[PDB]
Design an enzyme around this catalytic site. Sequence first.
Site, PDB file in Angstrom:
ATOM      1  N   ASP B  58       5.150 -13.679  25.975  1.00 50.14           N
ATOM      2  CA  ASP B  58       4.730 -14.985  25.491  1.00 50.14           C
ATOM      3  C   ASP B  58       3.348 -15.321  26.039  1.00 50.14           C
ATOM      4  OD1 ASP B  58       5.355 -17.628  24.159  1.00 50.14           O
ATOM      5  OD2 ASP B  58       5.134 -18.330  26.226  1.00 50.14           O
ATOM      6  N   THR B  91       1.360 -20.227  21.054  1.00 49.35           N
ATOM      7  CA  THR B  91       0.541 -20.068  22.248  1.00 49.35           C
ATOM      8  C   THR B  91      -0.354 -18.838  22.196  1.00 49.35           C
ATOM      9  OG1 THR B  91       2.501 -20.943  23.367  1.00 49.35           O
ATOM     10  CG2 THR B  91       0.638 -20.313  24.731  1.00 49.35           C
ATOM     11  N   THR B  92       0.161 -17.714  21.689  1.00 51.42           N
ATOM     12  CA  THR B  92      -0.660 -16.516  21.539  1.00 51.42           C
ATOM     13  C   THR B  92      -1.713 -16.706  20.454  1.00 51.42           C
ATOM     14  OG1 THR B  92       1.228 -15.178  22.247  1.00 51.42           O
ATOM     15  CG2 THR B  92      -0.588 -14.031  21.167  1.00 51.42           C
ATOM     16  N   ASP B 392      11.891 -20.964  22.946  1.00 52.43           N
ATOM     17  CA  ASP B 392      10.896 -20.789  21.897  1.00 52.43           C
ATOM     18  C   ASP B 392      11.518 -20.956  20.518  1.00 52.43           C
ATOM     19  OD1 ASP B 392       7.924 -19.690  21.584  1.00 52.43           O
ATOM     20  OD2 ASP B 392       9.139 -18.737  20.024  1.00 52.43           O
TER      21      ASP B 392
HETATM   22  N1  LIG Z   1       8.718 -11.080  10.509  1.00 57.33           N
HETATM   23  C1  LIG Z   1       7.391 -11.351  10.508  1.00 57.33           C
HETATM   24  N2  LIG Z   1       6.573 -10.853   9.556  1.00 57.33           N
HETATM   25  C2  LIG Z   1       5.253 -11.113   9.541  1.00 57.33           C
HETATM   26  N3  LIG Z   1       4.646 -11.883  10.463  1.00 57.33           N
HETATM   27  C3  LIG Z   1       5.344 -12.449  11.476  1.00 57.33           C
HETATM   28  C4  LIG Z   1       6.789 -12.205  11.555  1.00 57.33           C
HETATM   29  N4  LIG Z   1       7.229 -12.869  12.638  1.00 57.33           N
HETATM   30  C5  LIG Z   1       6.162 -13.486  13.209  1.00 57.33           C
HETATM   31  N5  LIG Z   1       5.038 -13.231  12.511  1.00 57.33           N
HETATM   32  C6  LIG Z   1       3.679 -13.735  12.834  1.00 57.33           C
HETATM   33  O1  LIG Z   1       3.399 -13.600  14.230  1.00 57.33           O
HETATM   34  C7  LIG Z   1       2.571 -14.686  14.655  1.00 57.33           C
HETATM   35  C8  LIG Z   1       2.834 -15.055  16.111  1.00 57.33           C
HETATM   36  O2  LIG Z   1       4.215 -15.316  16.337  1.00 57.33           O
HETATM   37  P1  LIG Z   1       4.726 -15.729  17.808  1.00 57.33           P
HETATM   38  O3  LIG Z   1       4.329 -14.651  18.787  1.00 57.33           O
HETATM   39  O4  LIG Z   1       6.177 -16.134  17.700  1.00 57.33           O
HETATM   40  O5  LIG Z   1       3.873 -17.052  18.147  1.00 57.33           O
HETATM   41  P2  LIG Z   1       2.660 -17.010  19.202  1.00 57.33           P
HETATM   42  O6  LIG Z   1       1.863 -15.787  18.826  1.00 57.33           O
HETATM   43  O7  LIG Z   1       1.938 -18.316  18.973  1.00 57.33           O
HETATM   44  O8  LIG Z   1       3.349 -16.909  20.540  1.00 57.33           O
HETATM   45  C9  LIG Z   1       2.848 -15.834  13.698  1.00 57.33           C
HETATM   46  O9  LIG Z   1       1.629 -16.475  13.312  1.00 57.33           O
HETATM   47  C10 LIG Z   1       3.543 -15.213  12.502  1.00 57.33           C
HETATM   48  O10 LIG Z   1       2.779 -15.399  11.308  1.00 57.33           O
END
Ligand SMILES: Nc1ncnc2c1ncn2[C@@H]1O[C@H](COP(=O)(O)OP(=O)(O)O)[C@@H](O)[C@H]1O
Lengths: 426, 525, 527, 49
Positions: B58, B91-92, B392
């Site tokens: 995360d 957050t990422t 999350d």
């Molecule tokens: N099954 C999936 N297929 C395509 N893209 C995905 C999928 N799951 C998540 N994502 C993409 O990954 C990105 C980051 O997700 P996540 O890591 O949960 O949030 P963050 O990066 O803010 O911590 C999101 O913007 C989303 O569009």
Amino acid sequence: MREIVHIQAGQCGNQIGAKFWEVISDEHGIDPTGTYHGDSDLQLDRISVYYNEATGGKYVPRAILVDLEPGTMDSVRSGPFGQIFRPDNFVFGQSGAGNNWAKGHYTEGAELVDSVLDVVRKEAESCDCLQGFQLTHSLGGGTGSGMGTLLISKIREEYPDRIMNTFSVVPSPKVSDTVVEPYNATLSVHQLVENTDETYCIDNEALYDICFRTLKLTTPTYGDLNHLVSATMSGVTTCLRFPGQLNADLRKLAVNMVPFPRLHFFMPGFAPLTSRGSQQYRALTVPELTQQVFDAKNMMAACDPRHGRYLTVAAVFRGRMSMKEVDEQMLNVQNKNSSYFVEWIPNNVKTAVCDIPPRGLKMAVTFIGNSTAIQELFKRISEQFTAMFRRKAFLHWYTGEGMDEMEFTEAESNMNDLVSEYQQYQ
Amino acid sequence: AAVKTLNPKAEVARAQAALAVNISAARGLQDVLRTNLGPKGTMKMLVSGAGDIKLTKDGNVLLHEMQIQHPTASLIAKVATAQDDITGDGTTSNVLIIGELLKQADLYISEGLHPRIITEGFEAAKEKALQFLEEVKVSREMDRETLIDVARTSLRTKVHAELADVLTEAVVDSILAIKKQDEPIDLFMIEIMEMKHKSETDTSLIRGLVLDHGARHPDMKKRVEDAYILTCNVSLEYEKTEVNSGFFYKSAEEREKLVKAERKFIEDRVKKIIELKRKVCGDSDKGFVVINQKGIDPFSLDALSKEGIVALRRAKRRNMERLTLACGGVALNSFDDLSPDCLGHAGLVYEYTLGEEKFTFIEKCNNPRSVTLLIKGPNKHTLTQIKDAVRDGLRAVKNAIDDGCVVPGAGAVEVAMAEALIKHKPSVKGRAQLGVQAFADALLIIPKVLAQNSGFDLQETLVKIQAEHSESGQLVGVDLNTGEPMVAAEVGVWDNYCVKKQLLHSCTVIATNILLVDEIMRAGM
Amino acid sequence: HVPKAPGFAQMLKEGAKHFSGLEEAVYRNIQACKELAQTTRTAYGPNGMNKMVINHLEKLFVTNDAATILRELEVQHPAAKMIVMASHMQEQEVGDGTNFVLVFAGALLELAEELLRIGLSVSEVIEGYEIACRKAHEILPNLVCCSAKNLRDIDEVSSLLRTSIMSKQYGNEVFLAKLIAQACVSIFPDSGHFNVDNIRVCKILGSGISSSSVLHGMVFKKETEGDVTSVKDAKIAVYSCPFDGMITETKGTVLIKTAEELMNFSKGEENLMDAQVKAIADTGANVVVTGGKVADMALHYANKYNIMLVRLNSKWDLRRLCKTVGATALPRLTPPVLEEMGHCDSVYLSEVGDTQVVVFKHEKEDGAISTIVLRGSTDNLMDDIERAVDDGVNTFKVLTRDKRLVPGGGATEIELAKQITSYGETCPGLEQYAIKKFAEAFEAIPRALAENSGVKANEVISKLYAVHQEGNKNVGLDIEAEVPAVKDMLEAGILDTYLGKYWAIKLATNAAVTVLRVDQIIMAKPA
Amino acid sequence: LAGEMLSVAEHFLEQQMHPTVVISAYRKALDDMISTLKKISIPVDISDS
Ligand SMILES: Nc1ncnc2c1ncn2[C@@H]1O[C@H](COP(=O)(O)OP(=O)(O)O)[C@@H](O)[C@H]1O
Ligand SMILES: Nc1ncnc2c1ncn2[C@@H]1O[C@H](COP(=O)(O)OP(=O)(O)O)[C@@H](O)[C@H]1O
Ligand SMILES: [Mg+2]
């Protein structure tokens, strides 16, 4: 019964708390990985007071180590016998306090103190009858004033009726570390006379002259500093950890130390003070150790007991001796030096003894008692607090975290009221 | 410098010097945190000074538990703290926008232009990006099958897709049975307990509560069916008066009379409990469980064990809030108005010991409105993977219920928003034409990182995605399995509206303020 | 003259290190876990060797069990702790097979380096291992040949407990199987929950292992403080309060106002304590066991009415005595005991090995609790047998939960190596290479049994596949002598812990997958 | 190539095989690699530019 959970919160609290369990594990004979090495009920009966017995014989100390620093508490992780505590009794903090009182309460304290209260709850499950809590911290530290003042207020929401025995490391009048030390000392004590009942005063920089002159140390450090402080910590919790004729636990110590609940600032100390070479060339008798605690050479704080007057005197001896000679020796001082004692108390000096010898020394006594020596030290803190606040110097470091100008005004009115509180019977 | 003259031990950075400090540090946090965005990201093992393993990926846990001492990295870590505080995920993707808003702006500021001209283009691009986000959101009336695909998107990006099928049933079914009739869902009603029993893929959803403390008496019943919950806040252990009083007795026969009399006020509280068990028709099993937040002495535990009353002690503060809703009773602070109306009900109250540590389970309630996710991870570091992914996922479905619209997935938002800024780029009519171009290219890092972590090409993927968007009307996105442009609204990949709204607002203000910094200095000693 | 290379993009550490990539992070986690696999490979099996391990407290731990070895070794590598904590979860779940996790997961990561450096990355080795791990849990119910169901007595469980004993105590496999059979069966809850805490080990220094026995009761290491050491009636009254009187809790203060209250206070205290000790002598008690201290006046009337006193300073030992004689610990001072008394057969004292012990020996009603009194020449030998005893107690808990058994000694891992290879050849994908390497990880487990026996493992592993021609499924290893000519395992009686084999494959596969997920390591400055 | 021939030699040292057995198998393999390259070779016209 009468279990006491220990909370070592702060940077200076973990340095004292590291050697605080070294004296208890050596006097009781508790093996850190075995079961026990005791001999009779003088050491094996009071194990359940400060330790919770696990299944199999392993003893776990009822200790909670709180610090807003990963690097400071890692010395108590795998260092000088630091692998004996519970793994959930090692609450780290990734955000440093920065020697600021407002940062440890509103920024760091808003996210950690809900988890610190969970550790006191898990320790209280193994306590069949909780007697109270102790808190070793400092006034010139960020975590000692941040996680020591906010932790002592949130613990009264769950324990409103239980007694408290706080240990406070006072700042030094000789040297200074930072200019916010009168700010951190005024704010931490202002919420300490509110709803607490016991607070000691230990000056660490004042002990550097004691180790140089009496204990014969050329270059002292923090390791040689906390050795005689641990002898003072073990002197108070002697009858609490060892049975005897003069039974006086922390419940009996909370009443017979203070006639009034607000004036609860004591001056700890112990006797004798011998070096590593001149210890065996000195005999220790009953009137030798009893008459050494009243002088200024056996004080843990930078104070002068030769210009003050005590209220309650308690002394705990170490070793099988005749305790009838203690009362007859101290009664002769109360008639020739009656300006230093109380005029209406027929037995000012209390008596306590055990049958367990200490480490290194053969006989040893400790000095616990309040006087007007804290009154002259509280005037210098309010003097530095007056000149810094009138120029409003470094107030944006505090008011930017959630404080205000009226917060220091109420912290100055009641702290100067404590000066007039000690000025009545002086 | 002027600061060197006043204070000789004070470092400083000038106008062209402080800009290179903040931009090169933003690329340092970008190149590290881009290896964990999406389901194809890699796990990061974080070891502290003690030696414990913190295996997570995360963006908030990575920035906090990283040995870095930089003023630019401390600014992005504070914006990343509030992203994981009010809305969970996002957050990422927060750090990667700031890493590109300063890198795409460096191509113009170093080529003669002023940094304030680029910041004027960011506000005009934020106004179009906020209006375009309200046109792409989809309202689906908060269906329970829609919330599965919302929770599945946030859970895959933190686990290896074998526990994402298990945790989605534990997150969606937990968030539905809390509040109804348009009420804000409180996340304090869900308890997160860490166990070690079976395996990581065994996390179930307990319909009641799981307490981490058990019975403190060996004669008490371990398994109790059809119980009555009596939630108390009184102190059954021995307490003294506030005024220091003590005792005074003359003979030894009067000594035992004072010990019997000093427990009379204690036993009067216990006699109110054992008489309540006789007034609820105790001609059956009729189990009784007292959670009892404050401590109980072993004298009262021996008295309650003879009547057949299980009595716990030392409960949490929120245990008098979660169990009060689950049992349906009243959390009392006194025994002056005891009645069967304040009693609870549970079909099964049992305990289980895991290495000399009991865990009290309360199940089989009618309408609990308070649940407990029972995480049973094998290792200590695996418990931190599931707990940081449950919160999350719980904050992801909480925002999808409160907000009435759902935002599409991976590339269905960022690619369509960047194409909308190109057609509105000559609408500013001034020197801020290149500011909208720097904002549109910074939003394209989300399809670029997801195409890079999956192993596909970076530039070849963005051509095919923008071709399917310009030649159609469907919001096409990125597919992390084949690389072809696939629509995110049809495959079941959704996102939150408040995450994408704050990503356009928190990242834009923190980029316009960093670009207007030219006097980084350290004074105060 | 000589230039140097400075930091490039993100070198902001204040004394910490950073690892990224396959060579700097993934391959170094493999080589660190490979050294732990080669460490405990010698101590695996019945022919395994002991290890004198000295921890930080300068005390000696000599054992051949891999669970207690890792608890004393202060490992600092982070990925090596993942295979240590996975072996610790095998000890907490079933209590046996902790050495199996270090061999299997140590061979999984060793063959993973032979796949990343030859071809596909960790995205297919992890998916390739989880396919073969799910198929490995399908052959294990098909390899069950015997069951621990018929005739649950001391005769049948003596042979079923030989496998857990002979792997750590090879020469003492017969005597320790009989001592673990007379203790585990005697504490049976009559088809209920079997508790492993109801078996204690009293280490008595003295003669060899032939003088060890199991006593139905509890054996302590304390004294009497009296002269009533010969008790045959054995009516035990258990108290948790200190047997010294009844004092208050707030302050405690005697107040005298006249001469009649001072002189009669000493005689009034003695008559108060006399009526309480004689209250338990009228109920027929003989043994009074307290938890706290005992005053001098309590010992005066205990010897007057001829009742024996037992001091138990430990509070967990006091709760085990209540489950021994069937009594209830009373928090109050001595009442007229109605029905919460204890009932034993013989409570006496005897000096065994220059150690005066207190034995609560049950003659007729033998099954309430069991205590194995071990005799050893050294204190370090009695700790190694206690580890072998506690593995036998945890084996009896496994047979209570699941009565199925699989043929051990190498017979199970070869059949697991044959069926997974059949799944690997019928897999039409690129992930079939990790499935065939998952079956070769089962090949190294009887390889460690042959290397410890001094036999060439190439000729040993060649005869195992030659006799497994689709219908035998039972031939393991005959490690009694050189030139093996290996025989059946059901005839020799080497079969143990099917549930132990079920969790050991699942925990070691999840341990090797968790290491392969780590691609970037960020450590801090150690203190 | 010398790093890879020692990479496969480390596998047989774990199989309780003596290093003189692997070297005697390496010398038999060395004599056959020289004879194989002479069969797949091709003569060159050195006068051709
Ligand atoms: N099954 C999936 N297929 C395509 N893209 C995905 C999928 N799951 C998540 N994502 C993409 O990954 C990105 C980051 O997700 P996540 O890591 O949960 O949030 P963050 O990066 O803010 O911590 C999101 O913007 C989303 O569009
Ligand atoms: N009589 C025997 N003949 C052949 N092999 C045996 C015999 N007894 C035990 N073994 C082998 O010794 C090994 C001991 O494994 P062990 O170290 O007990 O595993 P764990 O560490 O998981 O308990 C077993 O795998 C078994 O195959
Ligand atoms: Mg074994």
